Structure 1
Amino acid sequence: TIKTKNVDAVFVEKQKKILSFFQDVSQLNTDDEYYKIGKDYDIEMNMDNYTNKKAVEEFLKMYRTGFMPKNLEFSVFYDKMRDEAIALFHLFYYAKDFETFYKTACFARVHLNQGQFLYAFYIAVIQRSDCHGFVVPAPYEVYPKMFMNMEVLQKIYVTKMQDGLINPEAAAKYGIHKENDYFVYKANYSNAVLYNNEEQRLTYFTEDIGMNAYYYYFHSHLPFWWTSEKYGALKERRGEVYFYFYQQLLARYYFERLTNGLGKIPEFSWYSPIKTGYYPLMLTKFTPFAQRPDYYNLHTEENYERVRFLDTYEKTFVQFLQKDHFEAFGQKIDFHDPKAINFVGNYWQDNADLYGEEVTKDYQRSYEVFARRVLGAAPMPFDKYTFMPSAMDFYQTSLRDPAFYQLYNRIVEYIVEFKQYLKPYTQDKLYFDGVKITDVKVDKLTTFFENFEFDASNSVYFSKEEIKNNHVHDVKVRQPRLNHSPFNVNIEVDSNVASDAVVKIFLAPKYDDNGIPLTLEDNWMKFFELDWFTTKLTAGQNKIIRNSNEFVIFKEDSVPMTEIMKMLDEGKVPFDMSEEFCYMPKRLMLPRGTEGGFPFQLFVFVYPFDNKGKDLAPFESFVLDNKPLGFPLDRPVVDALFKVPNMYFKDIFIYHEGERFPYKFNIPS
C-alpha cells in the first residue's frame, strides 16, 4: 500500500543517474561511469554550459585555492565551508540542462568532500526546475551515521570486520539477525542506556529518524543563505513561513511533553547556567560530538564575545518593539501592519531576504548560528576546516538536543510579542453567513509502536571486490517508531445558501499542568494544524467525512532506495517521495497516548473559499488562500469575540495500545 505514480524511460534513466550518487557515498567505484566522467571533466572548457559566467569563474578561483578536503565533517554553519558549498551549489544550479548538471555532479563526487557534495547535490535536485518531480532518498538512508547511536554503529562495524557472525545465537542476543542476505540490527533509543534528566522520556520523539529527517528537508527546500526570489509569491511571506514552521513544530513537541508529564519548555538566560544537558551518543569518523553537562554556564570566557552578540541581537529587537514604527535594514517597518511578519521572521533567521540579496555574506553574523555554537558547548574550532561537532551543527541532528527546542521557543516567543501589535479578528471576519457546525464526531484515536527498518549501508566500507559485484546494500536497522491507527472525522454542517468553503482541522491541549481548561487568550499558539481542504456546501444539512490518511499536511514513510530501483523497473515512483518530500511523517501525527486516554481538543473551522486571489503554489502547495498561515490562530484571540456558529471545539482522547515502551520491542527471546 504505497501511493504510486507512472513514468517514462527517459525519467527512469535520469532518476537512476540521480540515485547513483547516493550509493556507497564515502567511496569511489573507479569502474562506474560516474568515475570516468568525473575524473576527466574539464570545467574551464565547459564554461558555455552554464547560465552564469561568473559563478563558474568564482568557483574555479575557489577550487584553485583548494576546497575542504575529503573525509572531514562538513557543516554549513562555518564560514569557509558554507561559501564552498554555495559556490558548488551555483555550479549545479546554473548547469544548462541535465547532461551538464550530471557531468558536473560526477566531478564533484569524485573530487570534493562527501558531506559538502551531498549537501549541495541534495539542494540542487530540489531547486533545479528540471528536477521537480524527481525523487531523492531519505536523509537517514543518505547519512545513517547521523540517525543512530554508537551502539548500533559498532555492532555494524564489528559484523563487517568479521565478515559475518562467529556465532548466530550470540548475535541474536545482541539484536543482530541475518534475514536473506541482509544483516538486521535492532536499535533502542538512547534512554534505554542513558537517563540523565527527564527529557529522556521523549527520545522516541526527538530521536525519531522521521522527525529529524523532516527538519533537514525543511532546510533544503529553502536555505537561510539563499534568497527566495525563485518562489515568487512566497518572497513577501518568507518570515511568516519561518515563524509558522517553528510555532507548529513546537506545539507538536509540547504535546509530547504533556503526555509524558513534563509541562512547558523551560526559558533560559545567556547570563545563567542552563539546566538540562545533552550527552550525544553519536560518532564522527574523526571525533566525538560535544557534550553539555547539566548546569552548563553559558557565560564563560570562551563565550564572552558570542554572548555580547546574542544579547544585542535580542535587544535591538526589544527596541523595535518599544519603537512600534522605525526604519531598519533600509525599510520602514510598521508593527500594526500584519505584513511586518515578513521582516520579523527574516530578522530572526538572518536570511538573505533580510538584506534583499541573492546569498548571505560572511559579515552578516547570524543569531541562530551563534546561539547554536554557544549552546553546542563545543571547544573553539581548531581551524577553518576542523571543528568539534555538536548535534546543533547539523540539520539532521538538531532535534535531538533539548536546547534546540529552548532556542526556538525563545525566538518564537519574541515573535509572539510582536504579534501583540496585531488587532485581533472581529466577529465579522470570522462569521460564515448562514453556516453552522452542529456536530463533530471522531473515530477512536490510538497510538502504538511498530518496527521500522532502513538501509544503513552508507555507514559501512566495502572492499574493492564487493564494490565491483555491487553487494553494497546489506545493512538494515530495525527500530520501533510511533504510529497510529487511521481515524475519521465527521463534520455535520447546516447552510441555507450553497457555496464553496474551506475546512480546517487543528489539534490542541485541553488542560495545563494544574488541569485548568485552556483559555484561547493564552493558548492560541499551542494549536497544531492537522488538515486543510475545500468542499461544496448545499442548502440544508451536509455530512463531511475526512480520513486521517487524506490529511494534506502529512506524508507516508519513504521507501528504501533499493525498492525505488525495483519500482523504476516497472516505471513507477512512490508519490509521497516526489511532491510530498518535506511534510511531517503521518505516523508522528499524534502524540503518544496514554492507556486511559489523554485529553486533547480538536478545533474545526469552516469559512468561505471566495475566489483564490492569491494562493501558494511555489515552495508549498499550502495556503491556496489570501489567509495568513495558521488562519485563524495566527494572532492573539479574544475568547468572547472569537467563537461563532461555524466553529466547533470537540473534546478528544488519545489512547495507546500494546507496549508503552519502545525498548520492550528489542528484547531478545
Structure 2
Amino acid sequence: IKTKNVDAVFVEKQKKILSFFQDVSQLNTDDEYYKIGKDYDIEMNMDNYTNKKAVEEFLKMYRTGFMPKNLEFSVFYDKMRDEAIALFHLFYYAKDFETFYKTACFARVHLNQGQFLYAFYIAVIQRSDCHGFVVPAPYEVYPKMFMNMEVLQKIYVTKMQDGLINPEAAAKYGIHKENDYFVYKANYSNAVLYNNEEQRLTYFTEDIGMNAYYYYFHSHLPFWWTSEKYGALKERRGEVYFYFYQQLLARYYFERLTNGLGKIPEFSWYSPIKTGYYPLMLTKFTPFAQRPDYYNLHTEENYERVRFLDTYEKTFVQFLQKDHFEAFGQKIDFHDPKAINFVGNYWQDNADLYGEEVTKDYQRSYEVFARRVLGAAPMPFDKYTFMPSAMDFYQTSLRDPAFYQLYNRIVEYIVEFKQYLKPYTQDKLYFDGVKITDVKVDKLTTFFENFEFDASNSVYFSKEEIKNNHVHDVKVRQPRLNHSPFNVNIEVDSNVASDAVVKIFLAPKYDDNGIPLTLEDNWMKFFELDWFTTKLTAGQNKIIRNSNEFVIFKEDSVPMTEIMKMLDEGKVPFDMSEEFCYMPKRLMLPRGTEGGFPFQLFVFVYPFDNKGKDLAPFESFVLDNKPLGFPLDRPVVDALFKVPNMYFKDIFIYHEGERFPYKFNIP
C-alpha cells in the first residue's frame, strides 16, 4: 500500500540483498552467489575494507574455525557471538556495495546459516550505503521460530509425500493446497495446552509481529555494539532501553488486564519460580527446554550463576544507597535525569557502558545469565552445543512469561532510580492560555483476522528440484489481533497563535479490583500512542488525529514475493524501508470485550519551539529535548500535575466477532 520509488541501480542492489533470504538452509551450486562465494579471497581484497584490524581479526578467527553448519546459533554464548561480531565487522567495513555483496556470498557459502543471517540482517540495517534498503520480515527468514512444532511437522510430512495423499483427510488437519501453495492453519499453543493462566495471553505472546518486533529492536541496536554511529543518540542510549521495556511491559499489562490476570509476578533467584513455560518448538538436534511450574532456580548447577546475578543487583542497590558515586570510569549523580543513560546501560551491560566499540567476554552480562537460568535448560554440552530455550533468541523471547518477569524486575529497579528525580512542577507543565476543553474518540473495537505468511524457507528441496526451480511453497495462516481505525478529536482553546506538541497516551482505568488508577503510582502504566505538532490559532481549535497517522506504529511487512513484484515496478514499501523497528499497528489496542473494557486516554498539549521555519518529523523531535515519554518519564504528584492543557477521557475497548482464535481454525 504505502510505497516509494527507486532507480534501477537501487533495484539491482535490493534484489542482490534479498537473494540471501531466499532458500536459506540449502545451497544452489548453479546460482551466482555460489560461484562468487566459493573462490572469493578476502586476503587478496584486504585494501577493500575500511578497517584492516577488523579483517585481520576475522581471518585469524576464521582459520581457527567457526561454528559448524548443522548446529543452532545463538548470540547469547561467547564464542558464537564473537564469530558473529567478527563476521559483522567484515560486512560493515567493506569499502562499497560490491565488496559487501562478495563478502556475503562467501559467508553464505562457507558458514553456519544462522550465524550468517544474524550477521547479515544487522549489517544491512547498520551500513550507511544500505540505509533506504529493505529486509524481509523475520518470520519469513526464520519461519521455524515463529510456529509450533505441530505445524512444522505437517509441513515436513507434506513435502516428504510430494503432496497431499487424500485432500479430504488433510482438510481435517487444517491443510489444503491453494494454487501452488500448501496452506497450514495454525492454532496458538493453548489450543493444545493450558498448563497455567498465562496461556490466556498466547495470541499476544506468540504473535509473529510482537516477536519480530523484538527481533528488530535488537537488530537496530545490539547490546554488544556501540551506538557511536548514531552520534547524539549515544548519550541517550540508556533512555531508549528503559523506554522500550517500560512501554512494551505497559502494553503487556493491558493484555493481562483484559484477561483478568493482574500484575506481573515477582521471583527470587533463591526460590522456586511459580510460572512454567512449555515451548512447543524444536531444532535439528533437540527440543527447546521446558520449565515446569515451581521450578527451583537454586540448584547445584546454578549456584555460581545465582551468586553473580545476586551481586549484579546488590551492586545497583548500593548505587541507590549513595546518590552520587563513581562507576565504570564515570561520575554518576542520581538527581540528574540524564543518569538514566548510565542506568540503562548498566542493566543491559552494553558496549556504551564501558567506552568500547564491542563488549568483551570478561564483561559478563546480567541479561545473558538471567536468561540462561530462567531458561531452565541443562548445562550446554560444549560451546556450540546447548539446549535452546525461548530466551536464547530474540525471535522467541516474548513467548515466555519469564521474559516479562525478568524485564519487569529490571525496569522496577530503574524506577527505584526514577524516584530521585524532582517531580515536574506546575509551571514546567503549564501551557499558558491554552486549554483542552474536550476530547472525543471514535469507536474502539478489536477483532481477529486470518493472516498468512510465507513459510517456505523451512522446506528442504532436491538437487534435481533446485535446478528445475520446482515450486513447493508454504503458507501458514492464523488469526491475529487487529482493530478498526479511529479518530481522536481534540478541542482546545488557544488564547493566541502558538505552535504546539500534542501527545497521546493510553492507560488503564481501574486495577483488577475496581480501584481507580492514580497517576502517583500508575504513571509507568501509561503507553504512548502519538507524538505530533500543530499550529494553534486564537479562539477555538480542533485537531482530528487518526490512528493510521499515529507515529509510533507500523503496517505489516510485505512478503518477499510481493516486494519482489514491486521492484519490477520501480517501487518499494515505505513502512519497511524506514519504519521497521516500530510496533505493528494492529496490536496497538489490547483485546477488548464484547461489552467494552474500560481504559482511559491522556491527551497533553504543550509548547513547541517555533523553528521560525517549516518542520519535518524526525528532527522536529530532536529540536525539543524533552525526555522520552514526557511528561510521564518520572513520578508524578497528582495535585502538582494536572493542568488545563491536559485531558483524561474515559474510553471503552470493545471486541467484535469471534472471541477465540481457534474458532477460525476449525475444520
Q: TM-score range by the shorter chain?
A: over 0.9
- Please say if residues 278 and 291 of structure 1, whose CA atoms lie closer than 8 Å, have aligned partners that are also in contact: yes
In structure 2, relative to structure 1, the CA distance for the partners of 1:323 and 1:613 (3 Å cut) is farther
Match of 1:64 in 2: 63
> In 2, distance between residues paired with 1:39 and 1:624?
50
Contact 1:85 1:116 in 2 (8 A): yes
Q: Per-residue deviation at 1:151?
A: 0.6
Contact 1:231–1:619 (CA<8 Å) still a contact in 2?
Answer: no
| Cα gap change, 1:566 to 1:647, in 2 (>3 Å) | same
Deviations 1:234-293 (A, max 9, x none): 111000000000000000000000000000000110111000100000011111000000
Deviation string, structure 1 residues 409-458 (Cα, Å, up to 9, x no partner): 00000000000000000001100011000000000000000000000001
| Further displaced range: 591-600 or 465-474 | 465-474
After superposition, the Cα gap between the structure-2 partners of 1:344 and 1:614, relative to the gap in structure 1 and judged at 3 Å, is farther
- 1:598–1:655 CA contact under 8 A, matched in 2: yes
Cα distance change on mapping 1:362 and 1:135 into 2, 3 Å: same
Matched residues in 2 for 1:385 and 1:309: separation?
23
User: Does the 8 A contact of 1:623 with 1:629 survive in 2?
Assistant: no
Q: CA deviation at 1:615?
A: 15
Q: Distance in 2 between matches of 1:597 and 1:48?
A: 64
Q: Matched residue of 2:409: which SS? A: helix
Per the TM alignment, residue 621 of structure 1 is displaced from its structure 2 partner at its CA by: 8.7
Query: Is there any run of 5+ residues in structure 2 with no aligned partner, and where?
Result: none
Alignment of 1:245-256 (within 5 A): 245-256=244-255
Displacement of 1:614 in angstroms is: 15
Matched-pair contact (CA < 8 Å) for 1:616–1:625? no
Give, in angstroms, the shift of residue 625 of structure 1: 2.7
Preserved CA contact (<8 Å) 1:554 1:584: yes
Partner SS state of residue 414, structure 1 = helix
Residue equivalent to 1:48: 47
SS at structure 2 position matched to 1:131: coil
**CA-CA distance at 1:609 after TM superposition:** 1.1
> Per-residue CA shift, 1:9-52, capped at 9, x if unaligned?
10110000000000110100001100000001000000000000
Aligned residues: percent identity? 100
Count of residue correspondences: 667
| 8 Å CA contact retained: 2:71, 2:112 | yes
| CA shift in 2, pair 1:620/1:251, >3 Å | farther
CA distance in 2 between counterparts of 1:507 and 1:286 reads 44
Give the CA deviation at 1:499.
1.2
Rate the CA distance shift 1:74–1:578 in 2: closer, same or farther, 3 A: same
Q: What displacement does 1:197 show? A: 0.1
Q: Is the Cα contact below 8 Å between 2:312 and 2:366 reproduced in 1?
A: yes
Distance 1:611 1:72, change over 3 A: farther
For 2:129, what is the secondary structure of its paired residue?
A: helix
Give the Cα separation in 2 of the matches to 1:71 and 1:611. Answer: 58
**2:348/2:367 contact within 8 Å kept:** yes
Task: Using the TM superposition, give the Cα deviation of residue 622 of structure 1 relative to its aligned residue in structure 2, in angstroms.
Answer: 5.9
Provide the C-alpha distance between the structure 2 equivalents of 1:439 and 1:261, rounded to a whole number of angstroms. 31
Q: 1:62 to 1:615 in 2, by over 3 A?
A: farther
**1:464 Cα deviation from its structure 2 partner:** 1.5
CA contact (8 A) 1:505 1:531 kept: yes
Q: Within 1, Cα distance between the matches of 2:510 and 2:347?
A: 31
Q: Distance in 2 between matches of 1:116 and 1:642?
A: 50
Report the Cα offset of residue 467 of structure 1: 1.6
Deviations 1:583-615 (A, max 9, x none): 010000100000010000000011011156999
Distance 1:622 1:225 in 2: 27
Query: Is the Cα contact below 8 Å between 2:180 and 2:472 reproduced in 1?
Result: no
Change in CA separation of 1:146 and 1:422 when aligned onto 2, cut-off 3 Å: same
Q: State the Cα distance separating 1:71 from its structure 2 match.
A: 1.9
- Change over 3 Å in CA distance of 1:144–1:617 after alignment to 2: farther
Deviation at 1:465, TM superposition (A): 2.5
Deviation string, structure 1 residues 536-584 (Cα, Å, up to 9, x no partner): 0111111100110111100000011011111111111111111011101
- Kindly tell me: are residues 139 and 630 of structure 1, through their superposed partners in 2, closer, same or farther at Cα, counting changes over 3 Å? same
Q: Give the direction of change, closer, same or farther, for the CA distance of 1:94–1:468 in structure 2 (3 Å limit).
A: same
What secondary structure, in the 3-state scheme, does the structure 2 residue paired with 1:428 have? helix
- In structure 1, how many angstroms separate the alpha carbons of the residues matched to 2:624 and 2:458? 44
User: What do the CA deviations read for 1:471-529 (whole angstroms, capped 9, x no partner)?
Assistant: 45610001000000000000001011101110100000000111011000000000001
Cα–Cα, structure 1 residues 433 and 619, in superposed 2: closer, same or farther, change >3 Å? Answer: closer
In the alignment, is the contact (CA less than 8 A) between 1:76 and 1:82 conserved in 2? yes
Whether the 8 Å contact between 2:609 and 2:623 is mirrored in structure 1 is no
**Mapped contact 2:180–2:471 kept (Cα < 8 A):** no
8 Å CA contact retained: 2:494, 2:536: yes
- TM-score normalised by structure 1 residue count: 0.98
Q: 1:548 to 1:59 in 2, by over 3 A?
A: same
Offset, 1:658? 0.5
CA contact (8 A) 1:616 1:624 kept: no
- Contact 1:344-1:415 within 8 A present in 2 as well: yes
- Superposed, 1:237-386 pairs within 5 Å as 237-386=236-385
Secondary structure of 1:622's counterpart equals: helix
Structure 1 residues 272 and 538: CA distance shift in structure 2, 3 A: same
Q: Distance in 1 between matches of 2:565 and 2:329?
A: 54
- Cα 1:425–1:616 shift into 2, 3 Å: farther
Rate the CA distance shift 1:624–1:445 in 2: closer, same or farther, 3 A: farther
Residues 508 and 525 in structure 2, CA contact (< 8 A), matched pair in contact too: yes
How far does the alpha carbon of each residue in 1:142-177 deviate from its partner, in whole angstroms, 9 at most, with x for none? 000000001100110000000000101011111001
Q: Could you tell me how far 1:468 is from its partner in structure 2?
A: 1.8
Distance in 2 separating the partners of 1:320 and 1:559: 46
Give the match's secondary structure for 1:282.
Answer: coil
Cα distance in 2 between the residues matched to 1:366 and 1:615: 45
Give the secondary-structure state (helix, strand or coil) at the position aligned to 1:623.
Answer: helix
| Residue in structure 2 matched with residue 555 of structure 1 by the alignment | 554
Once the two structures are superposed, the pairs formed by residues 501-512 of structure 1 within 5 Å of their partners are 501-512=500-511
Task: State the 1:656 CA deviation.
Answer: 0.2
Q: Distance in 1 between the 2:620 and 2:67 partners?
A: 37
1:80-113 alpha-carbon deviations (Å, 9 max, x no partner): 0010000000000000000000000000000011
In the aligned structure 1, how far is the partner of 2:192 from the partner of 2:383?
Answer: 35
Q: Which residue of 1 aligns with 2:604?
A: 605
Specify whether residues 619 and 61 from structure 1 end up closer, same or farther in structure 2 by C-alpha distance, changes over 3 A only: farther
Shift of 1:469: 3.0
1:372–1:618 distance in 2 versus 1, CA, 3 Å: farther
1-structure distance, mates of 2:521, 2:469 = 58
Task: Call closer, same or farther: CA 1:618–1:409 in 2, change over 3 Å.
Answer: farther
Q: Distance in 2 between matches of 1:416 and 1:229?
A: 26
CA distance in 1, matches of 2:399, 2:231: 34
Whole-Å separation in 2 of the counterparts to 1:582 and 1:35: 31
Shift in CA distance, 226/619, structure 1 to aligned 2, threshold 3 Å: farther
Superposition RMSD in Å: 1.6
On the 8 A contact 2:186/2:665 being kept in 1, the answer is yes
Describe the shift of the 1:622–1:171 C-alpha distance in structure 2 as closer, same or farther (beyond 3 A).
Answer: farther
